[PDB]
A paper describes a structure:
During energy production in Desulfitobacterium hafniense, MtgA catalyzes the methyl transfer from methylcobalamin (Cbl‐CH3) to THF in the catabolism of glycine betaine (GB). Despite its lack of sequence identity with known structures, we could show that MtgA forms a homodimeric complex of two TIM barrels. The topology of each subunit is characterized by a funnel of eight parallel β‐sheets connected by α‐helices on the outside that form a complex of two perpendicularly oriented TIM barrels. The active‐site cavity is located inside the hydrophilic core of each barrel.
Herein, we present X‐ray structures of THF‐ and THF‐CH3‐bound MtgA that allow us atomic insights into the reaction trajectory of this catalyst. The enzyme was purified to homogeneity and co‐crystallized with THF and THF‐CH3. Intriguingly, the X‐ray structure of the MtgA:THF complex illustrates electron density only for the pterin moiety of the ligand; the THF tail seems to be flexible. The identified binding site of MtgA consists of the residues Ser32, Asp75, Asp102, Asn129 and Asp194, which stabilize the aromatic ring system of THF by hydrogen bonds. The close proximity of the acidic residues Asp75 and Asp102 towards each other is most striking. In both poses, the aromatic ring system is well stabilized and most active‐site protein residues remain in their original position.
Author numbering:
A (entry chain A), B (entry chain B): 2 to 306
Write the structure that this text describes.
């Protein structure tokens, strides 16, 4: 299958994201310094294990080289001080783009103030995320940092149907759309994430991704890890049961044309990359019947066999 | 996915198979007494550890109870003598339907002849398979046994592309095709398996399944285990990498609306059921979007969380 809209393919410091099914490999987004991450000893001051963090980043680079799946790092923090330090470390110790991420918007806003309108921030930092409850001070922070790419979290607990994402992105009635809000902040590139409520509802998330790509052509993706980790019935079963269940959840959106996955903690990268690459390879092989051309030779189909 | 044709749903000795995506859970088909199966001490005579075989069958029943995925046993043999004994064992030690499977048509036919005319065989034995090399002797043996369900296997190296596999199924030119052959044998229920040439082309396998369900409405599925076990680069990585890659392969057809998977050796059931059930749960959550109703309460969506 193909989408009618011309697909936007962004190039974020060399990472290509978007396209028609099978054109580009899935972009994989692994979390670091998340709540409970054992490499963080003090999440307020940002005391973390530099060697362990570097080893995760090097592992990510190695797996990416092996499969062809590009990576963007999801950098989480619980305080301005911590997130600032984490970002400084990531800037120095990988080349990847990264999500500036926090549960608390004020942590993201304060970290942007510290980082400043640095050209490297413009090129590599992706704001996670412009969401339903965005504030004007947030948009001001984004603009003052000169950011160009954001995740648009097109999710509303009051708007669970896929088609509603037209409404969240474009606006409806007196509500500014999330795309319009992002554009007011100077964002030019929109990674659309419809949100995941729980494992089962990943199918609605994926349907939303399909509506977005079909009608607007923005890259579409999602973050099913939190749902998977809340699935104690599976996680407690150990290896390889947790990993194959996780693989089924994380690959599902890709099978319906999604472009990127936030797969949770980076420690799971070794199995996530192997599963996702498999799915990507099968999808691109289908291109041979559809006439879609691979956009890069650095693709799982050409690498993993 | 919702398919164009009215779907055929079969009830094979209590196993429902077929339908629109999300109607019924995936049917899982595990192999026993395959070449190299270590519980078999003599594959020519069909001598095996009956307790170990029963333990596999009991595990299958337990997993099926856990997830709601029904099971059919893939009973393999390399000799008439062996396959006859295996069938007799399966008849007595489970209530499940089963595939009468051999790579050798002479073995299938000989075994089938040994089993006579038996209503229990007619209800539970699924012929694996009507394939490109069928003979009139074979069709007549099937008719004598009074079988009503067969796997219709479009695996052919002269039919690589999906449409070529559909030509093998429906007939073309001077060939009646496999469905027509099966009907001459008195088969009334068709489990269509387009074959798996290799891992990447599982997407072509799946496209063939899609065309089958689109045009004919027969249940569709496939058997990707051999392709996965021959994937040396990924198998060499060990656990859990091999299993997650396997899970990506085995779940892919289900994500595109397929009805059953022959998942390989029964010893892999514990991880296969967990992956497949996950995919099934997500698909059934889509039911409201597609206009589909669950056909049973015994579905992963209602059991695995
Ligand atoms: C748990 C929340 C946190 N932040 C998120 N960010 C993205 N991008 N996607 C999500 O689903 C979520 N979910
Ligand atoms: C090698 C063949 C043997 N028999 C089969 N039976 C089914 N059902 N599916 C297959 O792929 C195959 N492959
Ligand atoms: Na892709
Ligand atoms: Na095959």
């Amino acid at each position: 299958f193909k989408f009618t809209a011309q697909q936007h393919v962004y190039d974020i410091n060399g990472v290509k994201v978007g396209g028609q099914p099978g054109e580009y490999p899935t972009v994989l987004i692994g979390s670091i310094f998340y709540r409970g991450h054992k490499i963080v000893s003090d999440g307020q001051k940002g005391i973390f294990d530099k060697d362990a963090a570097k080893a995760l980043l090097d592992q990510e680079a190695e797996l990416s080289a092996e499969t062809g799946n590009p990576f963007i790092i999801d950098v989480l923090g619980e305080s301005v001080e911590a997130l600032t330090k984490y970002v400084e470390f990531i800037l120095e110790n990988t080349t990847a783009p990264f999500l500036l991420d926090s549960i608390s918007p004020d942590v993201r806003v304060g970290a942007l103030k510290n980082l400043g309108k640095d050209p490297e921030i413009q090129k590599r930092l992706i704001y996670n995320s412009i969401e339903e409850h965005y504030t004007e001070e947030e948009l001001a922070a984004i603009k003052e940092a000169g950011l160009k790419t954001a995740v648009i979290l097109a999710f509303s607990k009051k708007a669970l149907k896929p088609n509603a994402r037209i409404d969240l992105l474009q606006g409806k009635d007196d509500k500014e759309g999330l795309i319009a809000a992002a554009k007011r902040a100077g964002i030019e590139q929109f990674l659309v994430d419809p949100g995941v409520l729980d494992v089962a509802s990943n199918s609605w998330t994926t349907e939303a991704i399909n509506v977005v790509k079909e009608q607007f052509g923005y890259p579409g993706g999602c973050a099913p890890s939190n749902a998977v980790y809340l699935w104690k019935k599976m996680r407690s079963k150990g290896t390889p049961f947790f990993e194959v269940a996780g693989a089924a959840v994380f690959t599902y959106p890709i099978t319906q044309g999604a472009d990127f996955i936030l797969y949770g903690p980076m420690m799971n990268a070794p199995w996530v990359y192997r599963a996702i690459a498999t799915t990507d390879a099968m999808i691109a092989y289908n291109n041979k019947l559809t006439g879609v051309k691979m956009g890069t030779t650095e693709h799982p189909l050409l690498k993993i066999f």
